[PDB]
Symmetry: D3
Subunit: 251 residues, 6 copies
């Protein structure tokens, strides 16, 4: 009746079969307010849950927290309450020099540098979005006017060594990830993030539709720092895009 982590019932969802899932709980209300009659449902741990209405249809907005584990919980419990489509939205740092701040990335596949994806399908299984969702996301992102990159995302269970960051406490990176960023860059990988492999694998192997869209707020190959105005616009466009993607997904 009431799922263990989200603290929400099916009734609270008002027939919603689609959820927009940001990572940050503070972003949930912002996304919900883009739609009609946003309603606060619950807030427990990293899970802030809102409901809103899009073209007369109920839409859930639920934060996942950082990482596949907390994400897998949110998706599972929402799925128990009837949610079938999951739209990942956020902002990300690109690792390709041709990708600029303000561009949109729609994940076509994820490098599974996570662990939670393995709890739903063996490693050989592709962390791939639902085609309709990826299509809707591409459409919404392009209609926003932004430059849109359809490509592979490296999905890491860590923010630091898994994204080959050396500016750390130990300043070192395990053997597996040494020189990994260059390897991903050469393989055409667009960006790092921390939830897509879990989300895509879990859903693609569980009869759920999922996809990931993100605004690029920084480029690790570029030394130039984006201004607050461009960052604000990119954040806003990212959530505008995901809501329009939701609109395209609704029937």
């Amino acid at each position: 009746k009431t799922v263990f982590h989200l603290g929400v019932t099916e009734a609270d969802l008002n027939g919603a079969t689609l959820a927009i899932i940001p990572g940050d709980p503070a972003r949930v209300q912002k996304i919900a307010e883009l739609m009609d009659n946003p309603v606060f449902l619950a807030s427990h741990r990293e899970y802030t849950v809102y409901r809103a209405e899009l073209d007369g249809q109920s839409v859930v907005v639920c934060s996942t927290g950082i990482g596949g584990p907390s994400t897998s919980i949110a998706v599972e419990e929402l799925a128990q309450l009837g949610v079938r489509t999951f739209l990942r939205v956020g902002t990300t740092g690109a690792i390709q020099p041709h990708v600029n701040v303000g561009d949109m990335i729609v994940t076509t596949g994820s490098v599974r540098l996570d662990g939670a994806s393995l709890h739903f399908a063996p490693m050989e299984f592709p962390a791939v979005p639902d085609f309709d969702v990826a299509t809707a996301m591409k459409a919404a992102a392009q209609e926003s006017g932004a430059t849109v990159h359809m490509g592979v995302t490296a999905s890491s269970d860590t923010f630091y060594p898994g994204q080959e960051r050396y500016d750390t406490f130990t300043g070192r990176v395990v053997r597996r990830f040494q020189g990994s960023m260059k390897e991903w860059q050469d393989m055409g990988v667009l960006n790092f993030e921390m939830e897509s492999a879990t989300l895509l694998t879990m859903c693609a192997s569980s009869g759920l539709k999922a996809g990931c869209v993100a605004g690029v707020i920084i480029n690790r190959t570029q030394k130039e720092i984006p201004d607050h105005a461009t960052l604000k616009e990119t954040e806003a466009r990212s959530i505008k895009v995901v809501v329009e993607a939701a609109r395209k997904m609704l029937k």
Copy 2:
């Protein structure tokens, strides 16, 4: 420069940056003749190479043979000669009951039950098609009147135990693949095929655009050996689709 296996030069390709790559060498000419001015280029081993023209643009048709290994050779050598986009048109076995023989399946991602993909990217890397290619294949399949399915393909380095076929000489399936078909089926995997994992991983990790459309010649809900009656019709439909998909990519 003449590539080792394909036996063709970049000049032979006449500026072609797109290749249609069937597995069956006999399908190459059949695909090429759906296009303009088809010309036989070379035939060596499982590699039959034709060149043709589609809306004024050169297109290569080149068989890959069966399997990731022979496929990886074909793509690499075509890539050396300037080909950047690869459209696999193949035959496949459906593992979902609702899929019918004669249907088309466009791979959105491949289960990597192959070995060759590992020679281009670690297993964590997704065997995913280029989005434009997958989109073009879906559109082409629909516009050709075909019934098309978008979804995950289990891409196996074997035809028999890796696709959990039991009607074999030993009748055994190695532990790893025991119950695998139902596991894939439960996970929503649409079909079995042998080249998509290699092709998709190799291309997605090498700056090449790839995709796989395949005609369903069998449903594993019924049997293990594809009926010989529907093969040619299904193939004919698939090549119509892949050529139209190529047209959309150009």
Copy 3:
């Protein structure tokens, strides 16, 4: 010099070298409250940070959120700011019949059913706590009058399939985890939780001291979803213990 996620500085920590790291942001204040001069530092995402004083020494309390990924971020950024010792206090599902709800388990080693641990050390590396911390946790737990169990914890990147829960949306569990709970039970594994493998492996391979003590909120031999009853009193004991464990580490 503020860390990326936690939003705190080294100055904010007032020389703290020890951190208590609950998973639940709500539990942070509750822990800091048991110490002297608790002060809210920051709250961003699943990271709520308080500072407090224990026997005249500054102690950080910082939520990790659910899962290895968000935990690894908290630990790394706290480490950048001078923290060297991390005490996880959390909730857990015991899988041994002789362990009761309300009991406490000090992890002596974690089964690495996560992904983040691999970003710090290969799978062969033991997810083992610092010996001094485990010692301090055992003594603190005993001195609190509660029944304590020393032993191995299965640390999963998921709450559902990785802990072999079948009462789910798909009702399926991937081949890897089919029959896994019985396997762990037969191997003497005490409980399931979601952060210890990451925490212990990361710290044991990074020159950081870590340990995990957890209150049993459910016995998996009985059911899959923990009773909401006694969730509070179990939580109350665990944080009492972890503070005393911290006191022993600072002595």
Copy 4:
């Protein structure tokens, strides 16, 4: 009655229990014509099937195409039709400086750098030839007057990165295969090819007798290009040897 890929029946084989299996379909007739009454059976895909008679006994010659996958099909379908002994013949590129063009390599074991072998046996299983076959091949090869090398062959699922070739489109080789040729060389590996691991593992784990014999036509460590006559002699010798090996295998 008719096998799906090869397009032949048991009757077409005329009681043959031994098959010579070259990679190249264009080579099948050549091998068959070394024996008595060569008869074209079928040609489909990379599979050209001939029948011939050796000392009054029927022998099948069937191409496999390049790679374990296409090979596994031919072996399986031939096995269904009664073939129990499989003699791989072809030419190869050595990686040892002491192995010269014109020499014969008889595989005593294969490094499993393929995928198909795993579909018959886990990686721990040795890709080993049947001892009688290896013995017969060594005998035939030595009786040919050529210098014969008995040793380990590296069996790669690719021609390019798996054999650490950098003269490619991307010019890159995955981490796994970087420095791999030198590793194999130092381990005494004689040559690269692309079928033996699959063939040998499949047969050894399925009650089939298999072995691989190859003429050396190029050496990765040598810069000299062998002349046309030498290449022709080596090709001719290789198929003469495999037929003589078949003769020794026939009972």
Copy 5:
């Protein structure tokens, strides 16, 4: 009624529930004679078995030989005869620069660079000692006045390449172990040894209590082969420690 390899009966053990298990057969008599009424039981292969009495309780001393395999046999067959606690006392090579010859190392966890541990638990399982044993070992070692180190031990199935020794016949080390010693050192791993991974994993997963204490006979930051001069003295201190650790475990 005699166990397969050890050649002893339960009656021979005289009610012993605790075993001291050195690797060296010659060390068995030395250990036994530190206690009361030492008696030779049997010697077959690498298994020399003695019995003695410590505070009126029977203690069995049994060599394991070198390696997880022979160790697993000894542990199993002793467990068949009622032994529940296993104290490994061994020799070890220091990985850290300031762990000196003659120091004692108590293993808090083992890097599983072995194969035998996998025969009892998958790699995710922690090679961790029983807490009481590790506690008793630390106490005994510290009370003895020895210089004691608590920490992670790299436990290898080989003495040479698995402990990155280069002064060997080939002078080669497989890719996996190239640079591994520095990796372990940077991760804070204290020492190399060959039995702890198997012993600890086996026991922790089989309801047996185990621990490993080892005398440092070489510092690997200096050389590869232990000097003979300090062997006897280091061994003498280590066995004094393990006997006292046995005393602490008995009750």
Copy 6:
């Protein structure tokens, strides 16, 4: 210059380039006495080392103890002292019905269910004996009059769960090895053993010549208990065979 574990020098071996390596130290003298001028060199741990003479050539006999780890030490340290050929001899339990007690098994390849082999070569590398050694062993075994089996051996790091034994303290076998004996049986594996994967992988990847021969003294699939006479005859034949195998190698 004495090697650390074996406690012998190169001079001690008197130019020996071949070693016979039984697992049991007690069997070293029994092997050495089949040859000329046997001499005790050293005994430390599980390593009893003898030197002997076979047709005028020095041959070392050295025990390895049970398991790959201790075996790898002996092989390495002997190799440092000039030994290049290693003949493992022992007795084993067969898992195939057609393999009777008294028969001889010459390993053609080993299932690497060990850990030490990985310290010399990745798992993909075949645990294969030197062909001359295997050939010499087959010949020597045949000349003794015993039925000889050439085939794959499952080489386990444990005696109990790795050989799927349930008559143990816990009675438990880890998931990996559950049903494993039947798997190997179906794959035609002849026997279980505990040293060959390490020995063969180490030597085949290090320019050393190795092989394994073993008399069968028990069959997992047979109820019948072998009598003392046949057992005694089998262990005696095994060492006779390995000495003759050594003779053929020299």
